[PDB]
Amino acid sequence: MYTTAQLLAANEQKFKFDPLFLRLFFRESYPFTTEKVYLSQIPGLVN
Amino acid sequence: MYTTAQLLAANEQKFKFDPLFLRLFFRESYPFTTEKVYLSQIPGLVN
């Protein structure tokens, strides 16, 4: 019982994580108000 | 009796002792007030 025994460390050492994909290619964000979403792409290929 | 001794310079002879460890990693010091010491570390692993 005579073992008060304070500590002096709270080491987390938890992760090695940095996305860089929400920062290098996905810089622009667009909020929604509609349930459905369209994303079209017109191709160019002539005779 | 008749000696007539003259003393010249002396030597030093100290160690080649430099910590490099009480100065690089152990920079922070604490005293005690308890007997035992804990060292806790939380395993940070989210799901």
Determined by which method? cryo-EM
Instruction: Please report which helix (H) or strand (E) contains residue A21, including its range.
Output: helix A21-24
Resolution of the determined structure in angstroms stands at: 3.8
DSSP for A22-37 reads HHHT--------SS--
DSSP for B3-41 reads -----------------SSTTTT-------SSSS-EEEE
Tell whether A1 is within 8 A of chain B (Cβ). no
User: Can you give the C-alpha Rg of chain A in angstroms?
Assistant: 26
By CA distance, what is B29's nearest residue in A?
A8
In 3D, which of A23, A11, A14, A19 has the Cα closest to residue B47?
A14
CB contact under 8 A, A6 and B34: yes
Tell whether B25 is within 8 A of chain A (Cβ). no
CB contact under 8 A, B41 and A4: no
Cα B42 to Cα A15: distance, rounded to the nearest angstrom: 12
Contact yes or no for B46/A17 (Cβ under 8 A)? no
Structure tokens at B1: 């009796």
User: Can you give the C-alpha Rg of chain B in angstroms?
Assistant: 27
A35 alpha-carbon distance from chain centroid:
23
